[PDB]
């Protein structure tokens, strides 16, 4: 089922089997805990490795940051959790967290607690402020406690997953698990919550190849996710996007839409055996631990799709008083420029496709919802189906009753009145499109401008753009470029002689028809 | 042999000389908005509140150059972050409110911040 | 010279091993290293700290300080970079810093110091380069 994604490899690092991957609670750093006996952290934005800590000489399964103390907790096959200062580089504390190696650690920023889960079938609580005294011991799990997560609706609650085919929800107060969920059938590798103030969910992953979704409120199993085609090592929920990201020991990661569980993507890397997953709680970074290293990956959807016409129908999709599937929104409010204005939505009629991009017409007569290689046109404020068309991309031009589309045949297309224009068809190839009157099409390390008159190459500007937008006179253009910005002059008369003559080269243009104004 | 006609040409070395050369070609009312000076400068007070407090000072200075009466001391440039349009969205004053403090951030930053509210406005 | 000495210190109150490129800082080397590196070079967990009018650059390793000292300077990046390269070379010789093992490989470290910084001007070194010398 369609979803705004864009998987990007933010940083990779090669090392012996990383059991845990973490994002720093408040920092842009991601910590991965390796089987090098070392845990290493790297800030995968500037691509700087901030620090490493040698916890043990035998594997460190878990590592997490207790950001407030400016300390990191690690649990290694020393059967200890050792604490270090990540800016004063020394070991803050050393303590025996368990009688066995520590698979996962969870940190409660609001309480002094870390509870750690270990394969001594017990999860123990340590309080950093007491100098890592044992606050509470939880006895409930009768098997290897693979992972621990804290519920974000009550931090006093956590769930622990154990290979005993349950995930047990426990409270701090109570050694014993205050209720048990039987979340899986072949042991539970992982537990995660689906984050938020109104989301009571659990996930279980198991070596029966499957990840299962559970609702902790209702206690039923919402659905079963195919997971992988081999034992699901870990599974987690993405917060923002409706998906579940799972990893398997087959070296494959799969992304599943959390609305029908149909395969969004399968990712392999040449690192293989993907042991863990974790997700950033502020959303759009997930990190996955593999045998041969760790990766931090960045998921797509960073920005919203919307457009403001002149009718006061400012249309978005998703959001409040609007559904994603259907289309709506209005914004007729003019309250003070210094704050964010209300939603001010008024209801808007039918849709039939998903909005990859959803946009009102710039002067208010059309609405366009674009999605899945198709555009559907709905009427400005009535929303009856006006028109239809093809569009992997749709952009309104300046004309906005002429628009540019990428129909993805290797020629950038113009559709006029939502009907295809074949008097427009670049003598460039295409790789991408910029709208406005002279359509910019990017191909062969060039930006070429084409005529909506006879589709000849007017000029080529040798710095490719981000965008072309053309003024509403179509003589002046504003080019968004990595250069920074251009304003160019299209001299109309010069173009008419040049285009007719076709003195403008197929892939290089005529450097006179356009001139660079500034 | 230092001073280039260029922007750069590459590499940390050229880059380090370059901020020296830039300060020459615009000395006028401090650097104002710190150049490539910013990178070393944080480490210069790694202990830990003092960096923010300092940073807050520069940010306040930078906003505007006011009258400069008794505790109205903001230098740097007169317009470069203005103050106070009525069409500016979501306004300059939001950052100005931080500087009004009870302790709203921590004490070192607090002492700097109270002076800094006084200083801009 | 711009770089007086390149020095490995123990904050036991003495310069464990140290290098005087040309005869100047003999006994002088030990007193500086012994007082200043004990206080973290008088640092606060800042790589540059200057005390008694001598620039000290450092990195703590255990009860030991790996120390670079200058009292003059040509560039920002450079002082750190020789110290840094030194810090790749020092665990090859001594398996981190530690006074007894530093002591035993006086020759190793000292030779690297001459090679790394020659007449106070920061040359470059590398663990393979170091090998030809101690061969």
From Swiss-Prot, chain A:
WD repeats: 13-52, 55-94, 97-136, 140-180, 183-224, 227-266, 350-388, 390-425
Keyword line: Acetylation, Coiled coil, Cytoplasm, Cytoplasmic vesicle, ER-Golgi transport, Golgi apparatus, Membrane, Phosphoprotein, Protein transport, Repeat, Transport, WD repeat
Membrane topology according to the record: Peripheral membrane protein
Presence of keyword Transport: yes
A GO term for molecular function: structural molecule activity
Subcellular location: Cytoplasm, Cytosol; Golgi apparatus membrane; Cytoplasmic vesicle, COPI-coated vesicle membrane
CC terms in the record's Gene Ontology section: COPI vesicle coat; cytosol; Golgi apparatus; Golgi membrane
Main location: cytoplasm
One GO process term, biological-process aspect: intra-Golgi vesicle-mediated transport
SUBUNIT field: Oligomeric complex that consists of at least the alpha, beta, beta', gamma, delta, epsilon and zeta subunits. Probably interacts with PEX11A. Interacts with SCYL1. Interacts with JAGN1.
Function per UniProt: The coatomer is a cytosolic protein complex that binds to dilysine motifs and reversibly associates with Golgi non-clathrin-coated vesicles, which further mediate biosynthetic protein transport from the ER, via the Golgi up to the trans Golgi network. Coatomer complex is required for budding from Golgi membranes, and is essential for the retrograde Golgi-to-ER transport of dilysine-tagged proteins. This coatomer complex protein, essential for Golgi budding and vesicular trafficking, is a selective binding protein (RACK) for protein kinase C, epsilon type. It binds to Golgi membranes in a GTP-dependent manner.
UniProt record similarity statement: Belongs to the WD repeat COPB2 family.
Record protein name field: Coatomer subunit beta'
Curated annotation (Swiss-Prot), chain B:
Subunit structure: Oligomeric complex that consists of at least the alpha, beta, beta', gamma, delta, epsilon and zeta subunits. Interacts with CAPN8. Interacts with SCYL1 and PRKCE. Interacts with COPG1. Interacts with ARF1 (myristoylated); this interaction is required for binding of COPB1 to Golgi membranes. Interacts (via trunk domain) with ARF1 (via switch I region); the interaction is direct. Interacts with KCNK2 (via N-terminus); this interaction increases the channel-mediated whole cell currents and promotes plasma membrane expression of KCNK2. Interacts with STX17. Interacts with TMEM115.
Note: Brefeldin A induces dissociation from the Golgi of the beta-COP and presumably the other coatomer subunits.
Protein name per Swiss-Prot or TrEMBL: Coatomer subunit beta
Gene: Copb1
Cell compartments where the protein resides: Cytoplasm; Golgi apparatus membrane; Cytoplasmic vesicle, COPI-coated vesicle membrane; Cell membrane
Sequence ranges of the HEAT repeats: 13-49, 50-87, 89-121
Organism of provenance: Mus musculus (Mouse)
Function comment: The coatomer is a cytosolic protein complex that binds to dilysine motifs and reversibly associates with Golgi non-clathrin-coated vesicles, which further mediate biosynthetic protein transport from the ER, via the Golgi up to the trans Golgi network. Coatomer complex is required for budding from Golgi membranes, and is essential for the retrograde Golgi-to-ER transport of dilysine-tagged proteins.
Tissue: Predominantly expressed in the upper one-third of the oxyntic mucosa and in most regions of the pyloric mucosa. Ubiquitously expressed including platelet, liver, heart, spleen, lung and kidney.
Shown residues in whole-protein numbering: 228 to 348 of 953
Swiss-Prot record, chain C:
Compartment annotation: Cytoplasm; Golgi apparatus membrane; Cytoplasmic vesicle, COPI-coated vesicle membrane
Subunit structure as annotated in this protein's UniProt entry: Oligomeric complex that consists of at least the alpha, beta, beta', gamma, delta, epsilon and zeta subunits.
Job description of the protein: The coatomer is a cytosolic protein complex that binds to dilysine motifs and reversibly associates with Golgi non-clathrin-coated vesicles, which further mediate biosynthetic protein transport from the ER, via the Golgi up to the trans Golgi network. Coatomer complex is required for budding from Golgi membranes, and is essential for the retrograde Golgi-to-ER transport of dilysine-tagged proteins.
Homology family: Belongs to the adaptor complexes medium subunit family. Delta-COP subfamily.
Protein name: Coatomer subunit delta
Name of the encoding gene: Arcn1
Span of the entire protein shown here: 1 to 135 of 511
């Amino acid at each position: 089922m369609p979803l705004r994604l864009d998987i990007k490899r933010k940083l990779t690092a090669r090392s012996d089997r990383v059991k845990s991957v973490d994002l720093h609670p408040t920092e842009p750093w991601m910590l991965a805990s390796l089987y090098n006996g070392s845990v290493c952290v790297w800030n995968h934005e500037t691509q700087t490795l901030v620090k490493t800590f040698e916890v043990c000489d035998l594997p460190v399964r878990a590592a997490k940051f207790v950001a407030r103390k400016n300390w990191v907790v690690t649990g290694a096959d020393d059967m200890q959790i050792r604490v270090f200062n990540y800016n004063t580089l020394e070991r803050v504390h050393m303590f025996e967290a368990h009688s066995d190696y520590i698979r996962c650690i969870a940190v409660h920023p609001t309480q002094p607690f870390i509870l750690t889960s270990s394969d001594d079938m017990l999860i123990k609580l340590w309080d950093w402020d007491k100098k890592w005294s044992c606050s509470q011991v939880f006895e409930g799990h009768t098997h290897y406690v693979m992972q621990i997560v804290i519920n974000p609706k009550d931090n006093n609650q956590f769930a622990s997953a154990s290979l005993d085919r349950t995930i047990k929800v426990w409270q701090l107060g109570s050694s014993s698990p205050n209720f048990t969920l039987e979340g899986h059938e072949k042991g539970v590798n992982c537990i995660d919550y689906y984050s938020g103030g109104d989301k009571p969910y659990l996930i279980s992953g198991a070596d029966d190849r499957l990840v299962k979704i559970w609702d902790y409120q209702n206690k039923t199993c919402v659905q079963t996710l195919e997971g992988h085609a081999q034992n699901v090592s870990c599974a987690s929920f993405h917060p923002e996007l409706p998906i579940i990201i799972t990893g398997s020991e087959d070296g494959t990661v799969r992304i599943w839409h959390s609305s029908t569980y149909r395969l969004e993507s399968t990712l392999n890397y040449g690192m293989e055996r993907v042991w863990c997953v974790a997700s950033l709680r502020g959303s759009n970074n997930v990190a996955l631990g593999y045998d041969e290293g760790s990766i931090i990956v960045k998921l797509g959807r960073e920005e919203p799709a919307m457009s403001m016409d002149a009718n006061g129908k400012i249309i978005w999709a998703k959001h409040s008083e609007v559904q994603q599937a259907n289309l709506k929104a209005m914004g007729d409010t003019e309250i003070k420029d210094g704050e964010r204005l209300p939603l001010a939505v008024k209801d808007m009629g039918s849709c039939e496709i998903y909005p990859q991009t959803i946009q009102h017409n710039p002067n208010g007569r059309f609405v366009v919802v674009c999605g899945d290689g198709e555009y559907i046109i709905y009427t400005a404020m009535a929303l009856r189906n006006k028109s239809f068309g093809s569009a992997q991309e749709f952009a309104w031009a300046h004309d906005s009753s002429e628009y540019a589309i990428r129909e993805s045949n290797s020629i950038v297309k113009i559709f006029k009145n939502f009907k295809e224009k074949k008097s427009f068809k670049p003598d460039f190839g295409a790789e991408s499109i910029y709208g406005g009157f002279l359509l910019g099409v990017r191909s062969v390390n060039g930006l070429a401008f084409y005529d909506w008159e006879n589709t000849e190459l007017i000029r080529r500007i040798e710095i490719q753009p981000k965008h072309i937008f053309w003024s509403d006179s179509g003589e002046l253009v504003c080019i968004a470029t990595e250069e920074s910005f251009f304003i160019l002059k299209y001299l109309s008369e010069k173009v008419l002689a040049a285009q007719e003559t076709h003195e403008g080269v197929t892939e290089d243009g005529i450097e006179d028809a356009f001139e660079v104004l500034g | 042999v230092e001073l280039i006609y260029k922007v750069c040409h590459a590499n940390p070395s050229e880059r380090a000389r370059f901020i020296r050369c830039i300060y020459n070609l615009l000395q006028s009312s401090s650097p104002a908005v710190k150049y490539e000076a910013a990178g070393t400068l944080v480490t210069l007070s790694s202990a830990p509140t003092a960096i923010k407090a300092a940073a807050q000072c520069y940010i306040d200075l930078i906003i505007k150059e006011s009258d400069n009466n008794v505790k109205l001391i903001v230098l740097d440039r007169l317009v470069e972050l203005k103050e106070h349009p009525a069409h500016e969205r979501v306004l300059q004053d939001l950052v100005m409110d931080i500087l009004r403090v009870l302790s709203t951030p921590d004490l070192e930053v607090r002492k700097k911040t109270l002076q800094l509210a006084l200083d801009l406005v | 010279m711009v770089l007086l000495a390149a020095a490995v210190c123990t904050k036991a109150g003495k310069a464990i091993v140290s290098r005087q490129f040309v005869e100047m800082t003999r006994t002088r080397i030990e007193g500086l290293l012994a007082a200043f590196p004990k206080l973290m070079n008088t640092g606060k967990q800042h790589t540059f700290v200057e005390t008694e009018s001598v620039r000290y650059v450092y990195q703590p390793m255990e009860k030991l300080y790996m120390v670079l000292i200058t009292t003059k300077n040509s560039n920002i990046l450079e002082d750190l970079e020789t110290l840094r390269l030194f810090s790749r070379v020092i665990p090859e010789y001594c398996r981190a810093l530690e006074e007894n093992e530093i002591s035993e490989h006086c020759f190793d470290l000292i030779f690297a110091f001459d090679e790394i910084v020659a007449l106070g001007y920061r040359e470059n070194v590398n663990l393979a380069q170091i090998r030809t010398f101690t061969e």
